Design an enzyme around this catalytic site. Structure first.
Site, PDB file in Angstrom:
ATOM      1  N   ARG A 151       0.801  -1.214   0.000  1.00 15.15           N
ATOM      2  CA  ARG A 151       0.000   0.000   0.000  1.00 15.15           C
ATOM      3  C   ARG A 151       0.833   1.263   0.000  1.00 15.15           C
ATOM      4  O   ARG A 151       0.313   2.329   0.346  1.00 15.15           O
ATOM      5  CB  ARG A 151      -0.952   0.002   1.196  1.00 15.15           C
ATOM      6  CG  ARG A 151      -1.897  -1.182   1.207  1.00 15.15           C
ATOM      7  CD  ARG A 151      -2.814  -1.171   2.415  1.00 15.15           C
ATOM      8  NE  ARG A 151      -3.153  -2.526   2.841  1.00 15.15           N
ATOM      9  CZ  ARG A 151      -3.909  -2.814   3.895  1.00 15.15           C
ATOM     10  NH1 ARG A 151      -4.414  -1.844   4.638  1.00 15.15           N
ATOM     11  NH2 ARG A 151      -4.160  -4.076   4.203  1.00 15.15           N
TER      12      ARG A 151
HETATM   13  N1  LIG Z   1     -11.741   0.603  -4.628  1.00 16.81           N
HETATM   14  C1  LIG Z   1     -10.619  -0.147  -4.696  1.00 16.81           C
HETATM   15  N2  LIG Z   1      -9.988  -0.371  -5.862  1.00 16.81           N
HETATM   16  C2  LIG Z   1      -8.873  -1.116  -5.937  1.00 16.81           C
HETATM   17  N3  LIG Z   1      -8.302  -1.691  -4.869  1.00 16.81           N
HETATM   18  C3  LIG Z   1      -8.830  -1.549  -3.636  1.00 16.81           C
HETATM   19  C4  LIG Z   1     -10.043  -0.750  -3.485  1.00 16.81           C
HETATM   20  N4  LIG Z   1     -10.352  -0.764  -2.188  1.00 16.81           N
HETATM   21  C5  LIG Z   1      -9.422  -1.509  -1.553  1.00 16.81           C
HETATM   22  N5  LIG Z   1      -8.516  -1.977  -2.418  1.00 16.81           N
HETATM   23  C6  LIG Z   1      -7.362  -2.820  -2.052  1.00 16.81           C
HETATM   24  O1  LIG Z   1      -7.611  -3.445  -0.797  1.00 16.81           O
HETATM   25  C7  LIG Z   1      -6.722  -2.955   0.205  1.00 16.81           C
HETATM   26  C8  LIG Z   1      -7.488  -2.684   1.490  1.00 16.81           C
HETATM   27  O2  LIG Z   1      -6.952  -1.540   2.134  1.00 16.81           O
HETATM   28  P1  LIG Z   1      -7.882  -0.558   2.988  1.00 16.81           P
HETATM   29  O3  LIG Z   1      -9.277  -0.658   2.452  1.00 16.81           O
HETATM   30  O4  LIG Z   1      -7.199   0.778   2.947  1.00 16.81           O
HETATM   31  O5  LIG Z   1      -7.823  -1.065   4.514  1.00 16.81           O
HETATM   32  P2  LIG Z   1      -9.006  -1.822   5.298  1.00 16.81           P
HETATM   33  O6  LIG Z   1      -8.471  -3.192   5.601  1.00 16.81           O
HETATM   34  O7  LIG Z   1      -9.197  -0.958   6.510  1.00 16.81           O
HETATM   35  O8  LIG Z   1     -10.169  -1.827   4.354  1.00 16.81           O
HETATM   36  C9  LIG Z   1      -6.089  -1.711  -0.377  1.00 16.81           C
HETATM   37  O9  LIG Z   1      -4.732  -1.554   0.021  1.00 16.81           O
HETATM   38  C10 LIG Z   1      -6.170  -1.918  -1.863  1.00 16.81           C
HETATM   39  O10 LIG Z   1      -4.988  -2.557  -2.343  1.00 16.81           O
END
Ligand SMILES: Nc1ncnc2c1ncn2[C@@H]1O[C@H](COP(=O)(O)OP(=O)(O)O)[C@@H](O)[C@H]1O
Ligand SMILES: Nc1ncnc2c1ncn2[C@@H]1O[C@H](COP(=O)(O)OP(=O)(O)OP(=O)(O)O)[C@@H](O)[C@H]1O
Ligand SMILES: [Mg+2]
Ligand SMILES: [Mg+2]
Lengths: 495, 42, 467, 72
Positions: free
Chosen positions: A365
């Site tokens: 990330r």
């Molecule tokens: N809308 C999206 N499009 C593409 N990849 C996503 C999207 N949402 C999440 N991801 C992937 O899933 C991972 C989840 O991270 P995040 O959502 O920031 O933390 P959490 O576990 O709190 O949901 C992200 O690092 C990303 O790589």
């Protein structure tokens, strides 16, 4: 002989006035002490048998002290002396190349640790102002990790996978690869690796230290071993000792890398420590605290901005998942604390595809940030091509479909690697370039490994000028691209 | 005091050091075992 | 008054007073520290003894220290001077720009609005997200929940909502990051500085920030949420203005409460959780309400431990939300993003008298067809699709097209995907799904719908694929 | 090809004949020292059997005076 007699003199035999307490009951690894009226919480008391303990509970009538050794060396009625300092560990560049246990007591032979500074294992992570975005790249020397799921300096990646899928191998290759930076001229690319071994067979750590000494990699590595036999309150503490030895560098403008291996065996030591305190077990018998335990430890892998020295402390926790269940309790506790993750499948590994990174699920990330521009150029295409290949590999028609299948298989064969064989960034750039632009689509997949080897032996011998050009100017210019294309075409011709 | 005591104990031992003092057969046996282990690995 | 510490176990400090005790919920200052350690009273053990929860590290506390009563609960600086600042639980600034120079302070343990103050008006909030707009339309002025495991999208989604909603907003905003990464908080700070939302040289800031990130002891994590609620309650009442209040992650509130509830000597409830889980959550979520004086729109990201929606924490919080949005790992592993589960997301404004009849009918047709496909999946996974009737094959094709079309590329996920972020207006969403259901696109392939905005882009991508 | 192999092998044999000796030296000397300490301790335990207790008590009382003076 007379050396030993000099060893006699110069020893501090001065006696001091010290507060003291008397043990009441030792059993289950938690001693109860009576007295110690002026004892601080989380202080380091010392028993009469040379042991140490952390004053954990300050109850009105006694002090619950967790012993940092084998509680068979503690009687009832022993004397506990408070050393008047929150649990400390020795830090400094005097530890580099030393195998110290969880408390900084060299288990190495090789004399004692000559450290002049002490930190607190129970410090606090940097706040929100000191930190700055991750900018610099941490070169793992592993093609799959460096191209697809890169890592930065200040990031805290996770390595998660089953028994014997090559997590320690990735850690050791990352440690070894830093040798080239730790010899160059600028102190800005030097990385001082650390390696915390938690609940691991002692023979494994001995052989690991031998391997790191074969590869000349102990000039900067510190191994903090709290192995399988060591009491639980030592496996619980080892990560914090290591993280302090790394925070020292981070706070003095240098760059450190700490590898906890495993953190699934610190949480087990902590669950032992808790259930023996009678604390109310939760989900899987883990205490509810088993999150704060890892969150507070991994929140220290920061990247201080330039007004705070500019140092950094990368972290590579290693979790181990039974039957590859990524949705278990501890794996998810840690997947929500870290900035990335590298899944090591156990069926890719059993296919000989090593290292077994499961690029479908792995992610970083901070990713594209803190990646060499050259590798970015070469590897964005690889990411897209591998994505397309994955989308279709569920059956084995047209020209484009078969093209995707063939290119993906070639790239998979290209990303395999051998142990203790890290590759400079430019070498990875060259190989993945020859792979993605399409100068391998005719060669049989089974041969793609041999090609790789041979190609390296050529490029490293002949065209080191081009590789130096790529390294210095961290980017593939047009003329460099043309020269590299010529090299690849010519080499492939003679095959 | 005890620093002087250790000093003089070493003095009075070294003075009776016409070799390894009051060692016993275990001395030679263990040393030979270790030496032969070194031979086996060398 | 002046008591003295008599026990220190983890984050729970037992203190003894010789004169009158402080009433429960007060704050106490440990006199003799290198920083400010505030202990908040929680119990009255008897023998003029109280049991307190420390809001900072309790390392170095000697049995017998001196504790000095404040006389009032924790009181934080509220007002228009907190906009653009950052604050810990006890309200100190942690952005290094000097004190928060306000006129009026607020106690963090106020009472919930009374029944004779609740507002009832309901109105859709358009977010630009296809699935959220279609199946679980958010309500303007109502609590909203994002239920997710670890690594599924709760934070990318809450950041997309931040962007879309807030930047196009007139009122203030509060972000109470409780028990979440510290680098994420730093990135959010430095990403609102560059958007002009926070201003470091003026008074035109719109966002207040409060942080209890995950390095903080259990005492702090369990109370930073109340600090956020207070900073938002002020803007709701003493300004009569519309507030947005984002919280991430609100499950850390209850988790921290349970971490520091074994030490308080309580019998542990179902899964080790505190016996007071439901009431502790209620007394907090009941101050996050739109009333007749203002209007708070709360977006809360709920973590679902070990991917168990029957866990007591999410199971209890499901009853405090207008619209839920259950992000699921099963969908995310298919690459669809946002991973929202269409058949677990719900809303209280999915009414034909609120969102009209075309919107309601399209949403219900989408859900019906997705549910039918889910029912088929059990057979499909073994006997393949070659063992289905023709209407079933057609249903499966439409369902896969719809599953893909629900996926959208976000602006904040450009760095991940590279694709360009899209806002899909509500009418475009309704139109596209109406067309997919009618059958106007049975000739295109599934992948033509993957990660596209309005259906025009789907048609364009299907044209690209055909060459 | 034999040239380099023999050149390395000569180094191998000389260094091995050095390593045998250095390792034997380490082993014998360290065991010697261990026995040194063992008997030295065992015999000083005996040598504490004199009649100097008065001097020890006097020194202890003087050091107590020192500590008391320092601690106020
Ligand atoms: N809308 C999206 N499009 C593409 N990849 C996503 C999207 N949402 C999440 N991801 C992937 O899933 C991972 C989840 O991270 P995040 O959502 O920031 O933390 P959490 O576990 O709190 O949901 C992200 O690092 C990303 O790589
Ligand atoms: N890149 C690689 N190529 C070939 N073999 C490998 C590679 N990485 C690891 N292995 C092999 O896998 C075996 C175990 O690997 P390793 O110990 O690194 O996994 P691990 O997860 O650390 O195991 P454990 O965690 O149980 O100690 C070893 O025999 C090692 O040689
Ligand atoms: Mg291993
Ligand atoms: Mg998150």
């Amino acid at each position: 002989s007379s050396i030993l007699e000099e060893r006699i003199l110069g020893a501090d035999t001065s006696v001091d006035l010290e507060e003291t307490g008397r043990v009441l009951s030792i059993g289950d690894g938690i001693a109860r002490v009576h007295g110690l009226r002026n004892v601080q919480a989380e202080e380091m008391v010392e028993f009469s048998s040379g042991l140490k303990g952390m004053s954990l509970n300050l109850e009105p009538d006694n002090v619950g002290v967790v012993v940092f050794g084998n509680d068979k060396l503690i009687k009832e009625g022993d004397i506990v002396k408070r050393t008047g300092a929150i649990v400390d560990v020795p830090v400094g560049e005097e530890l580099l190349g030393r195998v110290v246990d969880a408390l900084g007591n060299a288990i190495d032979g090789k004399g004692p640790i000559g450290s002049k500074a002490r930190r607190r294992v129970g410090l606090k992570a940097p706040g929100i102002i000191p930190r700055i975005s991750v900018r610099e790249p941490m070169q793992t020397g592993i093609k799959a990790v460096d191209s697809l799921v890169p890592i930065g300096r200040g990031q805290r990646e996770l390595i998660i996978g089953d028994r014997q899928t090559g997590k320690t191998s990735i850690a050791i290759d990352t440690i070894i690869n830093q040798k080239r930076f730790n010899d160059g001229t600028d102190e800005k690319k030097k990385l001082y690796c650390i390696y915390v071994a938690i609940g691991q067979k002692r023979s494994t750590v001995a052989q690991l230290v031998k391997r790191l000494t074969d590869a000349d990699a102990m000039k900067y590595t510190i191994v903090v071993s709290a192995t399988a036999s060591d009491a639980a309150p030592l496996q619980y503490l080892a990560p914090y000792s290591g993280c302090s030895m790394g925070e020292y560098f981070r706070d003095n403008g240098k760059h450190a890398l700490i590898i906890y291996d495993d953190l699934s065996k610190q949480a087990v030591a902590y669950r032992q420590m808790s259930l023996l305190l009678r604390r109310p077990p939760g989900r899987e018998a883990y205490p509810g605290d088993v999150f704060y335990l890892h969150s507070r430890l991994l929140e220290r892998a920061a990247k201080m901005n330039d007004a705070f020295g500019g140092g950094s402390l990368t972290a590579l926790p290693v979790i181990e998942t039974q039957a590859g269940d990524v949705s278990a309790y501890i794996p998810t506790n840690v997947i929500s604390i870290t900035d990335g993750q590298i899944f090591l499948e156990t069926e890719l590994f059993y296919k000989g595809i090593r290292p077994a990174i499961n690029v479908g699920l792995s992610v970083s990330r901070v990713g594209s940030a803190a990646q060499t521009r050259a590798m970015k150029q070469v590897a964005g295409t690889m990411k897209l091509e591998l994505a397309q290949y994955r989308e279709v590999a569920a059956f084995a028609l047209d020209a484009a479909t078969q093209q995707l299948l063939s290119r993906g298989v070639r790239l998979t064969e290209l990303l395999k690697q051998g142990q203790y064989s890290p590759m400079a960034i430019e070498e990875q750039v060259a190989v993945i370039y020859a792979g993605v632009r399409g100068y391998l689509d005719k060669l049989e997949p089974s041969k793609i490994t041999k090609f790789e080897n041979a190609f390296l032996s050529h490029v490293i011998s002949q065209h080191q000028a081009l590789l130096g050009k790529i390294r210095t100017d961290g980017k593939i210019s047009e003329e460099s691209d043309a020269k590299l294309k010529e090299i690849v075409t010519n080499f492939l011709a003679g095959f | 005091k005890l620093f002087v005591d250790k000093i003089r104990e070493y003095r009075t031992k070294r003075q009776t050091s016409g070799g390894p003092v009051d060692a016993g057969p275990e001395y030679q046996q263990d040393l030979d075992r270790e030496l032969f282990k070194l031979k086996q690995m060398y | 008054t002046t008591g003295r510490i008599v026990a220190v176990i983890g984050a729970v400090v037992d203190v003894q007073f010789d004169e009158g005790l402080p009433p429960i919920l007060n704050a106490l200052e440990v006199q003799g520290r290198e920083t400010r350690l505030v202990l908040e009273v929680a119990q009255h053990l008897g023998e003029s003894t109280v049991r307190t929860i420390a809001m900072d590290g309790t390392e170095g506390l000697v049995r017998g220290q001196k504790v000095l009563d404040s006389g009032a609960p924790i009181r934080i600086p509220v007002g228009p001077e907190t906009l653009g600042r950052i604050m810990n639980v006890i309200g100190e600034p942690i952005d290094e720009r000097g004190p928060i120079k306000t006129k009026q302070f607020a106690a963090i343990h106020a009472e919930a609005p009374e029944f004779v103050e609740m507002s009832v008006e309901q109105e859709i909030l358009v977010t630009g997200i296809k699935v959220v707009d279609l199946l679980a339309p958010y309500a303007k002025g109502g609590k909203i929940g994002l239920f997710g495991g670890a690594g599924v999208g709760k934070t990318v989604l809450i950041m997309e909502l931040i962007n879309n909603v807030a930047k196009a907003h007139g009122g203030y905003s509060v972000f109470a990051g409780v028990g979440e990464r510290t680098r994420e908080g730093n990135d959010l700070y430095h990403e609102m500085i560059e958007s002009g939302v926070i201003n470091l040289k003026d008074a035109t800031s719109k966002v207040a920030l409060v942080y209890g990130q995950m390095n903080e002891p259990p005492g702090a994590r369990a109370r930073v949420a109340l600090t956020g609620l207070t900073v938002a309650e002020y803007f709701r009442d003493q300004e009569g203005q519309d507030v947005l209040l984002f919280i991430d992650n609100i499950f850390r509130f209850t988790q921290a409460g349970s971490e520091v509830s074994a030490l308080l000597g309580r019998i542990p409830s179902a899964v080790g959780y505190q016996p007071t889980l439901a009431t502790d959550m209620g007394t907090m979520q009941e101050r996050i309400t739109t009333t007749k004086k203002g209007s708070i729109t709360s977006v809360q990201a709920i973590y679902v431990p070990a991917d168990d929606l029957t866990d007591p924490a999410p199971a209890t919080t499901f009853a405090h939300l207008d619209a839920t949005t259950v992000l699921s790992r099963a969908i995310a592993e298919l690459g669809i993003y946002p991973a929202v589960d269409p058949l677990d997301s719900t809303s209280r404004i999915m009414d034909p008298n609120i969102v009209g009849s075309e919107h309601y009918d399209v949403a219900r047709g989408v859900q019906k067809i997705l549910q039918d496909y889910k029912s088929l999946q059990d057979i499909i996974a073994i006997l393949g699709m070659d063992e289905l009737s023709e209407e079933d094959k057609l249903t499966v094709s439409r369902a896969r097209k719809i599953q893909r079309f629900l996926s959208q590329p976000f602006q904040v996920a450009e760095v991940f995907t590279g694709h360009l972020g899209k806002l899909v207006p509500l009418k475009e969403t309704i139109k596209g799904f109406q067309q997919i259901l009618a059958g106007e696109y049975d000739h295109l392939p599934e992948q033509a719908f993957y990660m596209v905005g309005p259906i025009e882009e789907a048609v364009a991508k299907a044209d690209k694929l055909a060459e | 090809v034999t040239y380099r192999e023999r050149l390395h092998r000569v180094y191998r044999e000389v260094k091995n004949r050095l390593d045998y000796h250095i390792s034997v030296q380490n082993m014998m000397r360290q065991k010697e020292q261990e026995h040194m300490i063992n008997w030295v301790e065992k015999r000083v335990v005996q040598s504490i059997s004199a009649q100097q207790e008065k001097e020890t008590i006097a020194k202890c009382i003087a050091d107590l005076k020192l500590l008391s003076k320092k601690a106020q």
